[PDB]
């Protein structure tokens, strides 16, 4: 599923990302935009045999298990396929755990490069959420 910007903002808000561990909702919408263009089925294969999955491009080497990634830690204790659903539940649960590490949202390079420090709230303005 490819989410509309405001549609995702409302869903992420329902899923608790608005002001989660100090991060305003704008950060997550902006991050989703740069990571997958709001596409839940986005996948990206890496050189190390790992794959990024979903709307927030979560890695199979550390966060989820796809049953065929070497060095799998499965920190979110979830099959990667759960991160490709039209239902964002699993991706948010995992993101909420990833961001609970000291590195916070710096876990998402696209966020650091394209969102960190900007007027992230711009991403949710205009939205009736």
């Amino acid at each position, epitope marked *: 599923k490819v989410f509309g910007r405001c549609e995702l903002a409302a869903a992420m808000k329902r899923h*608790g990302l608005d002001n989660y561990r100090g991060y305003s909702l704008g950060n997550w919408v902006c991050a989703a935009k740069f990571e997958s263009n709001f596409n839940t089925q986005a996948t990206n294969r890496n050189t190390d045999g790992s794959t990024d999955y979903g709307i927030l491009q979560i890695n199979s080497r550390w966060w989820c298990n796809d049953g065929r990634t070497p060095g799998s830690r499965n920190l979110c204790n979830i099959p990667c396929s759960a991160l490709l659903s039209s239902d964002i539940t699993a991706s948010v649960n995992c993101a*909420a755990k990833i961001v*609970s590490d*000291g590195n916070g949202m710096n876990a998402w390079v696209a966020w650091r490069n394209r969102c960190k420090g900007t007027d992230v709230q711009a991403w949710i303005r205009g939205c009736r959420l």
Partner: antibody
Amino acid sequence: EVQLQESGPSLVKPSQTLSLTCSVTGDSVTSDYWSWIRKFPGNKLEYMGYISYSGSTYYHPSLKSRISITRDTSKNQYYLQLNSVTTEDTATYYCASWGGDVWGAGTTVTVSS
Amino acid sequence: DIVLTQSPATLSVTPGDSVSLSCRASQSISNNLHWYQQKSHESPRLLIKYASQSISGIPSRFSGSGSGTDFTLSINSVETEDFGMYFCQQSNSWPYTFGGGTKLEIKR
């Protein structure tokens, strides 16, 4: 198949250090974020802190300064250190996964001279 | 620090009765509220995560609802093995905090 177990001195003297070990079995200590939660008399639960995958820790501000959470990847255990204890630190201590899906049986530590 | 207030402090019911336990937050915590059960001489058990999400392996009679500052843990016809303490815990902001708990006891 992940199981946790707390172990350590059951008695600590006022002003001394409380040390507990949490042994992780079934999975690696690097396969999750790990926490320490204690329960005071009167059903009062306190989330003491946790250590995440990067080694970074988060400590409860009310404790902050007296507490340290560390891990040993070779023994697959993580630990709790609480300095300068007082009678008010008497409680049941539990180690648990950050996800809350696995908890140790808990161990009582009493502070008394 | 976020304060969680649970009510009632205690409630006595007959097995088969259905109940609703309240947990209120001093600040909005969105859906970042979890429910635990702790029976006598046992460790806490996670029943519902993120306000309303089911956990595989937990009896279907347990369900959660709410958002923001108002949450409810519901039990469809309480069973003989459900008596004990129930606590809510928030993970929206550090430090994580627990409610004071509600004790579910047997009515006679």
